[PDB]
Design a protein around this ligand. Structure first.
Ligand SMILES: *[C@@H]1O[C@H](CO[C@@H]2O[C@@H](C)[C@@H](O)[C@@H](O)[C@@H]2O)[C@@H](O[C@@H]2O[C@H](CO)[C@@H](O[C@H]3O[C@H](CO[C@H]4O[C@H](CO)[C@@H](O)[C@H](O)[C@@H]4O)[C@@H](O)[C@H](O)[C@@H]3O)[C@H](O)[C@H]2NC(C)=O)[C@H](O)[C@H]1NC(C)=O
Ligand SMILES: *[C@@H]1O[C@H](CO)[C@@H](O[C@@H]2O[C@H](CO)[C@@H](O[C@H]3O[C@H](CO[C@H]4O[C@H](CO)[C@@H](O)[C@H](O)[C@@H]4O)[C@@H](O)[C@H](O)[C@@H]3O)[C@H](O)[C@H]2NC(C)=O)[C@H](O)[C@H]1NC(C)=O
Ligand SMILES: *[C@@H]1O[C@H](CO)[C@@H](O[C@@H]2O[C@H](CO)[C@@H](O[C@H]3O[C@H](CO)[C@@H](O)[C@H](O)[C@@H]3O)[C@H](O)[C@H]2NC(C)=O)[C@H](O)[C@H]1NC(C)=O
Ligand SMILES: *[C@@H]1O[C@H](CO)[C@@H](O[C@@H]2O[C@H](CO)[C@@H](O)[C@H](O)[C@H]2NC(C)=O)[C@H](O)[C@H]1NC(C)=O
Ligand SMILES: *[C@@H]1O[C@H](CO)[C@@H](O[C@@H]2O[C@H](CO)[C@@H](O)[C@H](O)[C@H]2NC(C)=O)[C@H](O)[C@H]1NC(C)=O
Ligand SMILES: *[C@@H]1O[C@H](CO)[C@@H](O[C@@H]2O[C@H](CO)[C@@H](O)[C@H](O)[C@H]2NC(C)=O)[C@H](O)[C@H]1NC(C)=O
Ligand SMILES: *[C@@H]1O[C@H](CO)[C@@H](O[C@@H]2O[C@H](CO)[C@@H](O)[C@H](O)[C@H]2NC(C)=O)[C@H](O)[C@H]1NC(C)=O
Ligand SMILES: *[C@@H]1O[C@H](CO)[C@@H](O)[C@H](O)[C@H]1NC(C)=O
Ligand SMILES: *[C@@H]1O[C@H](CO)[C@@H](O)[C@H](O)[C@H]1NC(C)=O
Ligand SMILES: *[C@@H]1O[C@H](CO)[C@@H](O)[C@H](O)[C@H]1NC(C)=O
Ligand SMILES: *[C@@H]1O[C@H](CO)[C@@H](O)[C@H](O)[C@H]1NC(C)=O
Lengths: 12, 603
């Protein structure tokens, strides 16, 4: 399956 | 002759099922024939297959046991297929193998024990398969292993501590499994390790102090593991670390001042822990730092001024803490700042004048702070500005006039501020401006005369900012779907051509001084849902056209003075609160049925 990489992309 | 090489390859061709494009190339005419085949690489001398690349040819089936006859194989790539079932042990018999890529397949059940039989394996990539149960402990016997990737399967249990015995290993990606337990400290003993990706598991305890020993570690990601506890201070010793992702965890305590020594450090993300403390003043010294993200922690401090002088800093995310003091006013001066979101803090002071210095800054989020003073006129000269949300502040003075020049400017929330005087008229020039909210401000002036000419403006809200004069005349009204003007002094009639707003959904004209008839053109709006005209001077009769409108949900006309019958129609089941305080209204809803005669007030 896909796993996330890189920085946390929470946004406003 | 009997060629094992040919038996092996042809077994592969019959056993793996794919489109013609796959094995059509492999044919025996009526002299070492296989070396010309797709992805088959012979040894110049022996004519034995030393490399087989089978990747990304949609192919299913099972590997045949005959694959063991390619005994000179150094390189096997099965990556990116539909291959399924238990991992075939047949592979473990190719003992000269060096790199083996199993990735982006669906292999299931437990991983089989033979793997240690490949004495020389340098690279093993299993990323994105269906494996379950324990990580194989045999891997710990591979002396030359450099890259190990088991990420993206369903493996459970603890990381085998014996892995920390792989002293040529530079790359370990375990992330995206279900692995549990405490992280074995012996992992710190991996001497050549540079990349470590363990995140998106469910672990126990903390980062062990012993990881500080990974001298050459560059990338360290363990996120959305359930790691907790105080953040190990010995980590400052990792001088080659350039990527540190600890976000979406439970780490508590403060940021060890020792971290000011992570001198190679480029990206740092602690988002969404409970990290209460303040930013080490030592962070001025991270000269290569680019990403700094502390979002959604309990940090309370003053941002060290030196961060304004960080040369390479591009994104800065501080929001949802409680910081105080002022932003470093030197901030944008590196000319590299790209996004910045400091919202929902206690920041005070003026907005730095330099933020866009290099015209690279497209996202500026300041809202829900105590920022005071005027908006730097430099923001209007920032050509890359895309999204700007500064509301819920003390911002002052008059809104500078250069924003409509900006070719990318889409979203602007200036609301809940102290702005005064006149609403820049170039807002209606802004080429892409989608959303403009000026609500609750103190300019006493009228709307820009061209405001409804805005080409792309969908949502415009000026409510409860002190507006005077009439409503401009709604000429283009191309994209508007939400218009909030309530709570002002606007006078005059409601423009007859409101009909030109075809995409209009919600319209709040409440709490003004607006007189004259209610324009019937409202009922010709195809999509109109919410109409609030209440608390005005509107007179005359409610156009009968409105009962023919099957689209309309809230129509609030109360606290006007209207007369005549209430439209019968879709209005029949409407909330009767909507017609109150109009003493001349007539009909079934208000419980004063209508005078029926020759002369009426309608038509
Ligand atoms: C809608 O309202 C606006 C203004 O808003 C309201 O202004 C008055 C009516 C208050 O009751 C408040 O509720 C609001 O703030 C009206 O437009 C405004 O009209 C003004 C005159 O009615 C006009 O002022 C005039 O001032 C110049 C000089 O005028 C001489 O008289 C003044 C006092 O009137 C005197 O002190 C002065 O020294 C002068 O000798 C005059 O020459 C100007 O050109 C102007 O006519 C405002 O400028 C004007 N403001 C705006 C924003 O348009 C409007 O008439 C109202 N419409 C309706 C239908 O009622
Ligand atoms: C244009 O801007 C207007 C003003 O900037 C918008 O109208 C106003 O919107 C705000 C919130 O969006 C609203 O105030 C509310 O804020 C307080 C905080 O609510 C949250 O926080 C509390 C504790 O802080 C927490 O329990 C919750 O999570 C809650 O969601 C509330 O305490 C307060 O009572 C209120 O609900 C204003 O009332 C609102 N109206 C006005 C006249 O200011 C407007 O929506 C916007 N328009 C568009 C189209 O975007
Ligand atoms: C097994 O085969 C895989 C596919 O044949 C191969 O993966 C692909 O490898 C290339 C590298 O040669 C990557 O292509 C591009 O990578 C970067 C950007 O990500 C570019 O800068 C490069 O110039 C290059 O164009 C692919 O991204 C990569 N993945 C996929 C899905 O195609 C594996 O490398 C092979 N395994 C081994 C061990 O060699
Ligand atoms: C701004 O920050 C505060 C606290 O960091 C947030 O307020 C809390 O939000 C949580 C989750 O939504 C609620 O369970 C609490 O009840 C809130 N506390 C109070 C005192 O109301 C607030 O939501 C943040 N704002 C944004 C936009 O993220
Ligand atoms: C964020 O920190 C500040 C402290 O700088 C808290 O601000 C309030 O400060 C006043 C004095 O200026 C005192 O009444 C209290 O110390 C604080 N208020 C309260 C209600 O305790 C602020 O409350 C903090 N934000 C939080 C805790 O959400
Ligand atoms: C605009 O904002 C500034 C800052 O809040 C105000 O003027 C300054 O601040 C206080 C009042 O808040 C004054 O006592 C200072 O003397 C002013 N100078 C400096 C350097 O801070 C001003 O009152 C605000 N309102 C306007 C200009 O209408
Ligand atoms: C139009 O705007 C008014 C703003 O006053 C809305 O009515 C108020 O709604 C708030 C909820 O945010 C209530 O707390 C107030 O009590 C309401 N005011 C009154 C006088 O009752 C109204 O709902 C808006 N209409 C639409 C369709 O959005
Ligand atoms: C964090 O983990 C949970 C469950 O493991 C998951 O639902 C959530 O999406 C994760 N967060 C991110 C950003 O992927
Ligand atoms: C960093 O490494 C060495 C340990 O051998 C020493 O400089 C110092 O004790 C370490 N820092 C710590 C443990 O905080
Ligand atoms: C970052 O600092 C390191 C020190 O290890 C140096 O080698 C490097 O040149 C700096 N950054 C860049 C982009 O060169
Ligand atoms: C405007 O935004 C586009 C992407 O939408 C970007 O490619 C371009 O560089 C931006 N232009 C300026 C002047 O910032």
């Amino acid at each position: 399956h896909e796993v996330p990489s890189g920085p946390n992309p929470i946004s406003n | 002759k009997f060629s094992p090489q040919l038996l092996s390859l042809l077994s592969l061709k019959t056993s793996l099922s794919g489109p013609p494009s796959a094995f059509q190339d492999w044919k025996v005419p009526v002299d070492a024939v296989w070396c010309s085949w797709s992805g088959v690489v012979c040894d110049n001398v022996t004519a034995q297959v030393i490399s087989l690349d089978l990747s990304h040819r949609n192919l299913s089936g099972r590997i045949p046991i005959q694959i063991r006859y390619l005994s000179s194989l150094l390189y096997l790539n099965l990556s990116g297929n539909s291959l399924e079932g238990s991992f075939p042990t047949s592979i473990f018999d190719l003992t000269k193998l060096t790199t083996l890529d199993i990735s982006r397949n669906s292999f299931d059940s437990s991983f089989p024990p033979g793997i240690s039989k490949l004495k020389f394996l340098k690279v093993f990539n299993a990323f994105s398969n269906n494996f379950e149960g324990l990580l194989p402990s045999d891997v710990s016997r591979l002396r030359f292993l450099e890259e190990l990737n088991f990420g993206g399967s369903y493996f459970e249990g603890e990381i085998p501590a014996a892995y920390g015995g792989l002293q040529r290993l530079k790359f370990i990606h375990l992330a995206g499994n279900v692995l549990g337990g405490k992280l074995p400290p012996r992992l710190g003993l991996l001497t050549e390790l540079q990349h470590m990706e363990i995140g998106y598991n469910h672990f126990n305890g903390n980062i062990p102090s012993e990881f500080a020993l990974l001298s050459n570690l560059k990338y360290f990601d363990v996120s959305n593991a359930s790691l907790s506890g105080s953040l190990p201070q010995e980590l400052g010793n990792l001088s080659n670390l350039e990527t540190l992702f600890l976000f979406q965890n439970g780490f508590t305590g403060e940021i060890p001042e020792s971290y000011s020594n992570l001198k190679s450090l480029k990206l740092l993300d602690f988002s969404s822990n409970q990290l209460s403390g303040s930013i080490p003043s030592g962070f001025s010294t991270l000269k290569n730092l680019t990403w700094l993200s502390l979002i959604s922690n309990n940090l309370s401090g003053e941002v060290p001024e030196g961060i304004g002088e960080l040369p390479e800093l591009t994104t800065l995310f501080l929001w949802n803490n409680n910081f105080t003091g002022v932003l470093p006013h030197k901030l944008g001066s590196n000319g590299k700042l790209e996004t910045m979101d400091v919202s929902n803090n206690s920041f005070t002071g003026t907005i730095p004048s330099s933020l866009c210095h290099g015209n690279k800054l497209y996202k500026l989020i300041l809202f829900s702070n105590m920022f005071e003073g005027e908006l730097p006129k430099s923001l209007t000269r920032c050509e890359s500005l895309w999204r700007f949300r500064s509301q819920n502040n003390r911002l002052n003075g008059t809104i500078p006039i250069g924003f409509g020049s900006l070719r990318n400017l889409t979203f602007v929330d200036l609301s809940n501020n102290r702005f005064t005087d006149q609403i820049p008229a170039d807002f209606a020039t802004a080429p892409v401006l989608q959303y403009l909210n000026l609500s609750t401000n103190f300019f006493h002036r009228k709307l820009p005369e061209n405001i409804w000419k805005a080409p792309n403006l969908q949502i415009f809200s000026a409510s409860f900012s002190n507006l005077i004069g009439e409503i401009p005349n709604y000429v283009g009204c191309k994209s508007f779907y939400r218009i909030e003007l309530q709570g002002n002094s606007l006078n005059g009639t409601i423009p007859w051509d409101i009909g030109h707003c075809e995409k209009l959904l919600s319209l709040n004209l409440s709490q003004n001084h607006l007189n004259g008839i209610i324009p019937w053109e409202i009922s010709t709006l195809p999509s109109i849902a919410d109409v609030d005209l209440s608390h005005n001077l509107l007179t005359g009769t409610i156009p009968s056209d409105f009962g023919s409108s099957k689209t309309i949900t809230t129509f609030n006309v109360s606290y006007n003075q209207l007369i005549g019958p209430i439209p019968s129609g879709s209005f029949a089941h409407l909330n009767p609160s909507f017609f109150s305080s109009n003493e001349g209204l007539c009909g079934d809803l208000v419980g004063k049925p209508c005078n029926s005669d020759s002369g009426l007030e309608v038509l």
